[PDB]
Amino acid sequence: VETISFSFSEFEPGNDNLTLQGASLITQSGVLQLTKINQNGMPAWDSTGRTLYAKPVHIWDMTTGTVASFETRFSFSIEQPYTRPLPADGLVFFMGPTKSKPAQGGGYLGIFNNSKQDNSYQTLGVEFDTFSNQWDPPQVPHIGIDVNSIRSIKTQPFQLDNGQVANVVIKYDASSKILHAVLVYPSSGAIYTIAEIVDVKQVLPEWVDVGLSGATGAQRDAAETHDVYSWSFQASLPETND
Ligand SMILES: CC(=O)N[C@@H]1[C@@H](O)[C@@H](O)[C@@H](CO)O[C@@H]1O
Ligand SMILES: [Ca+2]
Ligand SMILES: [Mn+2]
């Protein structure tokens, strides 16, 4: 079994295991700020930032035909300091081609370029969407499972506990092809669950980059924070299949 795992209970500036792109920054207090916060202490609009694990992950093998099972857990907080103008845009856990650079920001969350369904994206994502775009359901925020498109194959509305820490668990079972995700707000005790069938061998390339991406809106003050406090990941790929 080919395995890879990492766990950050806190983030350290200078850690070479993480690749920061765009506006993402690790504070001295150990917090990963995906999108920029201005010197005045308020979130900046038109900001896009991503953080990738510095090593690619072997998710499936064409020779043996095996597929990896994986699990990721992370804690984040989104604080929307204003109710108007409408806050945007959200954050997303994603897996895609290696050596990837930020895509379009705003409603595309830094991982897509348009709202089309396109096999070539070869991207899988679990989002936490705060702004309702034309391709979105009316309810926000919502959790969504994105397969080669910003238009989710399935969504689950959730209530934001403003500025509070949320715990997320995303697990993929290769045998059943079920991607199941859970979001919990310890502060209120709220629990949300969502699941869908995803055949990763049909969606992702054999080796992928794993990361987190966040973005604020394209209109002035259409923003919020996208802070991550901890992140762990583990993938197990059976080397053979007899
Ligand atoms: C397509 C696109 O990125 N749209 C963005 C949307 O996501 C949101 O950020 C909004 C802020 O009011 O600005 C634009 O409409
Ligand atoms: Ca959206
Ligand atoms: Mn959405």
From Swiss-Prot:
Gene3D superfamilies given for it? Answer: 2.60.120.200
Keywords carried by this UniProt record = Calcium, Glycoprotein, Lectin, Signal
Q: Which InterPro entries match?
A: ConA-like_dom_sf (IPR013320), L-lectin (IPR016363), Lectin_LegA_CS (IPR000985), Lectin_legB_Mn/Ca_BS (IPR019825), Legume_lectin_dom (IPR001220), Leguminous_Lectin (IPR050258)
Instruction: Give additional notes from the record.
Output: Binds one manganese (or another transition metal) ion and one calcium ion.
Q: Which Pfam families match?
A: Lectin_legB (PF00139)
Q: What residues are glycosylation sites in this protein? A: N17, N113
Entry protein name? Lectin
Q: Does the keyword Glycoprotein apply?
A: yes
Q: How does it assemble?
A: Homodimer.
Q: Which GO terms describe its molecular function?
A: carbohydrate binding
User: Which CDD domains would you find in this protein's record?
Assistant: lectin_legume_LecRK_Arcelin_ConA
| Post-translational events | A minor C-terminal proteolytic processing site is observed at position 268.
- Protein family: Belongs to the leguminous lectin family.
Q: Which SUPFAM superfamilies match?
A: Concanavalin A-like lectins/glucanases (SSF49899)
Protein function: Galactose and N-acetyllactosamine specific lectin.
